Amino acid sequence: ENIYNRLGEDLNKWQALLVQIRKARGTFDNAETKKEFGPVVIDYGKVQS
């Protein structure tokens, strides 16, 4: 409801944030299960689903 009130009657209804949500699906929705960086590996395995 907060989002609806903030963006009530946007370009049409939102038309903007619904666009960046698909981009925010990044760092996510990939066959990659754990992000490696040097010797530090962060495994987003329990939350992936």
Partner: peptide, 23 residues
């Protein structure tokens, strides 16, 4: 011989099924 192998060293070809944006 290659044909009957299909049905000679043959490489194993593999492909996967995944899902993205629920497709």
């Amino acid at each position: 011989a290659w044909t009957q192998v299909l049905l000679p060293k043959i490489k194993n070809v593999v492909h996967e099924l995944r899902i993205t944006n629920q497709v």
